C-alpha cells in the first residue's frame, strides 16, 4: 500500500483519485492519499473551486518511484513531482500518517471496478501516448488535442493516440475498396493488431486509457479515439472470439462507471446504435447491450 503525500493545499479544489473524489478547502491541513492499491495505474486529478474549467491530472504507478503533489503558485496548479531521496520520503509519509492528515484510498473489498477499467492499461504505453520522458508520470487535461485532431497545433502537449481513419489508404487496399470499407477486418487484424499494436492487450489498453481521459478530464479527442477503436472492432466481420468477449466486459464497466448526467456529451449516438444494432458484432456484446438499454435507452 503506497502514498502520494501533498506538501499543502493552498487553494480550494476537488481532488479525484481514480473513480473517487474529495472536496478540500483553501489552506485545509490536507497532506495526501494513503493505501493506494499497488499493481494498477492510478490518476490523481483536480478541479479548482474558482475555475471549474481545466480539469487536469496525473497518471502514475507507485512501483516506478515516490510521487508527491505540491501547489505551484506561479503556474497556479497542483503538480506531481518525484522525490528521489527514499529516506526523506518515508520520513515525510510516516509523519503525515501519524498526524492523520491523509485520506485513505476508499476501496471496498468486493469492488473490482478500477481493475476492470485499467485491465490492459500500462504506464509504459501511457508515456508513449503522453510524451514527457523526463517524468515517470503523465499529465493530461481537458484541452489537450490529439495528433489526429492537429492534422485536421503544439506537438509537445498532444495526445499521441494511434490514428484510425476509415477513409485512408492505410484502411483500404487498392482493388479491395468496397470490401475493406464495408468489412474492416483487414484494417483491424493486419494493419492495427499485427502491424501497429502487436496484440489485443495493447489495443484494449489504449481504448481503456482514451475512455478514462474522456470521463475524468472531458477530453473530446480522447472520446473520439475511444469511439473510433470500438467502431473498428464492431465494423469487422472477423474478430477473435476472445477479443469480442473481452470487449463486452471492458465496455460494460465503462458504461457502468460513466456519470449518469454525462451520457449526453460522452456517448456518440451514431456509433453506439451502429455497434449494438447494425454492425457485424451487433449480437456479440450481450452485457454491454443490456447495461446500455437499461441505463441509456434515450440515446438508443
Amino acid at each position: 500500500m503506497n502514498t502520494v503525500p501533498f506538501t499543502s493545499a493552498p487553494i480550494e479544489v476537488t481532488i479525484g483519485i481514480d473513480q473517487y473524489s474529495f472536496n478540500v478547502k483553501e489552506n485545509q491541513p490536507f497532506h495526501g492519499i494513503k493505501d493506494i492499491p499497488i499493481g494498477h495505474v492510478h490518476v490523481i486529478h483536480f478541479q479548482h473551486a474558482d475555475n471549474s474549467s481545466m480539469r487536469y491530472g496525473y497518471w502514475f504507478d507507485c512501483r516506478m518511484g515516490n510521487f508527491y503533489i505540491q501547489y505551484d503558485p506561479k503556474d497556479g496548479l497542483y503538480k506531481m513531482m518525484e522525490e528521489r531521496d527514499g529516506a526523506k520520503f518515508e520520513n515525510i509519509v510516516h509523519n503525515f500518517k501519524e498526524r492523520q492528515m491523509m485520506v485513505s484510498y476508499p476501496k471496498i473489498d468486493e469492488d473490482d471496478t478500477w481493475y476492470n477499467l485499467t485491465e490492459f492499461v500500462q504506464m509504459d504505453k501511457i508515456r508513449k501516448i503522453v510524451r514527457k520522458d523526463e517524468n515517470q508520470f503523465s499529465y493530461v487535461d481537458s484541452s489537450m488535442t490529439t495528433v489526429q485532431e492537429n492534422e485536421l497545433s503544439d506537438p509537445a502537449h498532444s495526445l499521441n493516440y494511434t490514428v484510425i481513419n476509415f477513409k485512408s489508404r492505410e484502411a483500404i487496399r487498392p482493388g479491395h475498396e468496397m470490401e475493406d470499407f464495408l468489412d474492416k477486418s483487414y484494417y483491424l487484424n493486419t494493419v492495427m493488431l499485427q502491424g501497429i499494436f502487436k496484440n489485443s492487450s495493447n489495443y484494449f489498453g489504449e481504448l481503456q486509457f482514451a475512455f478514462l481521459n474522456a470521463m475524468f478530464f472531458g477530453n473530446y479527442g480522447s472520446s473520439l479515439q475511444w469511439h473510433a477503436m470500438i467502431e473498428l472492432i464492431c465494423s469487422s466481420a472477423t474478430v477473435p472470439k476472445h477479443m469480442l468477449d473481452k470487449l463486452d466486459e471492458i465496455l460494460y464497466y465503462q458504461i457502468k462507471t460513466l456519470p449518469e448526467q454525462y451520457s449526453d456529451i460522452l456517448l456518440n449516438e451514431r456509433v453506439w446504435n451502429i455497434c449494438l444494432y447494425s454492425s457485424f458484432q451487433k449480437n456479440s456484446l450481450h452485457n454491454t447491450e443490456k447495461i446500455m438499454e437499461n441505463k441509456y435507452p434515450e440515446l438508443l
Binding site: 477513409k167 485512408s168 489508404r169 483500404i172 475498396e177 468496397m178 470499407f181 464495408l182
Partner: protein, 237 residues
C-alpha cells in the same frame, strides 16, 4: 460542400468538373415466376458522367454480366460506379482530370471518396439540385447503344450537339435540363414535341434535332408548358 442554386455559375467556370449520375447503372424488370413468386431480370445500364461546360458525356455501359453471381446489387452498383469513375479519371491525362466530381445522389459520396483516395486534390461534392439525368435513357441514341451492348463499353458523346457554336454553356445546360425534365415528367408528349415536324431531322453525329434559334425558342416554350400542365395534374392545382 454542396452544390445549389446559390453557386450555379461555378458549373460554367474553367475548373474541369464532372457530374456523375448512377441512377441508370442497375436496371431491372420485375416479373412473376412460374411458382407465382417475384423475380428481377437485370438489363444493361449506364453511368452518366457529364462535363457541364463542354457537353462531353462519358457514357460507361454496364453489361448485365457484371451482376452475375453478385449479392446486394443496389449496393454493388454504387461501388461499381465509383470504380468506373476512378478508372476514367486515371485514364485521362493530368491536365484533363477534373478538380471536382459532383454526384447527383448522396449515396455515391463514400464509394467515390474511397475509390478516389489516390486523388486527394479532387473534391467529391453532393448537390441540392434535382437534376433530371435519370431521363438520359429517353434519348433514343443513348438508349440504343446501352441495349445493344454485348460487353462492357465506354461511348463518348457531346450531349449539347453543336449548340456551343451559338450559345453559352450556361444556356446549353438550361436547355439540356429542360429537355430532360420534360422527357422525365411525360416521355411521350416530350418526344412528340421534338419530332412533330418531319422536316427537322437529327444529324447522324447528333442526339437532338437541327432546330434553328427560332425553332428552339418554340420547342423550349412547348417543353415548359408540358412541365407545368403535368405539374397541375400531379398535384390538382
Amino acid at each position: 460542400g454542396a452544390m445549389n442554386s446559390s453557386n450555379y455559375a461555378e458549373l460554367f467556370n474553367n475548373d474541369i468538373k464532372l457530374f456523375v449520375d448512377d441512377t441508370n447503372v442497375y436496371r431491372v424488370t420485375v416479373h412473376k415466376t412460374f411458382e407465382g413468386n417475384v423475380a428481377t431480370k437485370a438489363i444493361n445500364g449506364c453511368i452518366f458522367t457529364l462535363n457541364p461546360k463542354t457537353g462531353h458525356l462519358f457514357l460507361k455501359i454496364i453489361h448485365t454480366s457484371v451482376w452475375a453471381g453478385q449479392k446486394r446489387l443496389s449496393q454493388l452498383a454504387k461501388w461499381k460506379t465509383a470504380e468506373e469513375v476512378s478508372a476514367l479519371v486515371r485514364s485521362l491525362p493530368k491536365e484533363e482530370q477534373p478538380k471536382q466530381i459532383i454526384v447527383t445522389r448522396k449515396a455515391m459520396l463514400d464509394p467515390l471518396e474511397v475509390h478516389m483516395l489516390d486523388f486527394p486534390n479532387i473534391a467529391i461534392r453532393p448537390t441540392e439540385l434535382r437534376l433530371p439525368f435519370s431521363a438520359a435513357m429517353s434519348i433514343d441514341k443513348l438508349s440504343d447503344v446501352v441495349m445493344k451492348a454485348t460487353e462492357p463499353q465506354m461511348v463518348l458523346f457531346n450531349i449539347y450537339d453543336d449548340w456551343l457554336d451559338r450559345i453559352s454553356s450556361y444556356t446549353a445546360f438550361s436547355r439540356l435540363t429542360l429537355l430532360l425534365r420534360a422527357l422525365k415528367t411525360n416521355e411521350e408528349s416530350a418526344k412528340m414535341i421534338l419530332l412533330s415536324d418531319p422536316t427537322i431531322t437529327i444529324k447522324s453525329y447528333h442526339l437532338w434535332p437541327s432546330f434553328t434559334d427560332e425553332q428552339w425558342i418554340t420547342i423550349e416554350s412547348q417543353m415548359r408548358d408540358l412541365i407545368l400542365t403535368e405539374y397541375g395534374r400531379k398535384y390538382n392545382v
